[PDB]
Amino acid sequence: TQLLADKLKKLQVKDFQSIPVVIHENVSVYDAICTMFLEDVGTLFVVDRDAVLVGVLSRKDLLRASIGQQELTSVPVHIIMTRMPNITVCRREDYVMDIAKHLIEKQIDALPVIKDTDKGFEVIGRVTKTNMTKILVSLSENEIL
Amino acid sequence: GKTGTQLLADKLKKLQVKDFQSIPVVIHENVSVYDAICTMFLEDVGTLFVVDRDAVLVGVLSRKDLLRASIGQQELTSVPVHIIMTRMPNITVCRREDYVMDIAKHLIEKQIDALPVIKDTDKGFEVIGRVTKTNMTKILVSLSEN
Ligand SMILES: Nc1ncnc2c1ncn2[C@@H]1O[C@H](COP(=O)(O)OP(=O)(O)O)[C@@H](O)[C@H]1O
Ligand SMILES: Nc1ncnc2c1ncn2[C@@H]1O[C@H](COP(=O)(O)OP(=O)(O)O)[C@@H](O)[C@H]1O
Numbered sequence: 001t002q003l004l005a006d007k008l009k010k011l012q013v014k015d016f017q018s019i020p021v022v023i024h025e026n027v028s029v030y031d032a033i034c035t036m037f038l039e040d041v042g043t044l045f046v047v048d049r050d051a052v053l054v055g056v057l058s059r060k061d062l063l064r065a066s067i068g069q070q071e072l073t074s075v076p077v078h079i080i081m082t083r084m085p086n087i088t089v090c091r092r093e094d095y096v097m098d099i100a101k102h103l104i105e106k107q108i109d110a111l112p113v114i115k116d117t118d119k120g121f122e123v124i125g126r127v128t129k130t131n132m133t134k135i136l137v138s139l140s141e142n143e144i145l
Numbered sequence: 146g147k148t149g150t151q152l153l154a155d156k157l158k159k160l161q162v163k164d165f166q167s168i169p170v171v172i173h174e175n176v177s178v179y180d181a182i183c184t185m186f187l188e189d190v191g192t193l194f195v196v197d198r199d200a201v202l203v204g205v206l207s208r209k210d211l212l213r214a215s216i217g218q219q220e221l222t223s224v225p226v227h228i229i230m231t232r233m234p235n236i237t238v239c240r241r242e243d244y245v246m247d248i249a250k251h252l253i254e255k256q257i258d259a260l261p262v263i264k265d266t267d268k269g270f271e272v273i274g275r276v277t278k279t280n281m282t283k284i285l286v287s288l289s290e291n
Contacts, residue, residue: 129278140157
């Protein structure tokens, strides 16, 4: 059954990514939490003015913040975001299997799908445990490839 | 089925929760929102299950449930979690003998991350395990290594 595993290891992000949810880095912690409920997501991708990736913000970053009791309404998200270097990203041609393992090796719920531009790492989707769970329902229902 | 991907599908459909579950992380219903937020970081989970004086399921709590609460206009941080829990009977649960992929549809269709695994007792559901999207993602990985 090794060529079957081979073939799964070649499913690509292109086909299984969700949209990106992004915020500007100069947005407040309060505003980012708001966006989190409006978009009903679990991770936000933080961008700079033009509009390259610069960090990420999970439910736990924000909860940590709101329990910290700084002036939330004034406090910009670059203060608390997880920053570049230093985020696990992927690209549309990356294999979902690899991505699944990163999500496990690194215990995070989502990766950003970036694109190498003449601006930098721009954000063009996400891939998350939900995507993985969907790919896993699709296979059990024999609906892939 | 006739094909490789069909046989793969066939085994996927036969996997039961009992073999793909994580420990339950469980709090009492008279604990504060603040304590819940702490337990949540301590145990490093995204869903706490809430039980009563008899150890019987009474609700769930997600990370966003507690985020919403901790920034409510009203002070909700000091209040008991039963004020703010998603209550029974509108919690979706599962049992050891349930098929994993039946549970994967529920996670997706109902748009939740975890289902408590429970045991029927004459007094209600006893929490005996956790099933989440992390469990699900591990099964995918295993497909590629195994
Ligand atoms: N793609 C990522 N790359 C690097 N770090 C991340 C990434 N996504 C989240 N993180 C950080 O790692 C932690 C894990 O958060 P995550 O697993 O998404 O959910 P949560 O914090 O809601 O339980 C958070 O501190 C988050 O900011
Ligand atoms: N197993 C469940 N059954 C019923 N409701 C749940 C269950 N798990 C979570 N919920 C509720 O559904 C909403 C979404 O939960 P979930 O996706 O798990 O976390 P979050 O709110 O961080 O996105 C929350 O209000 C939570 O109380």
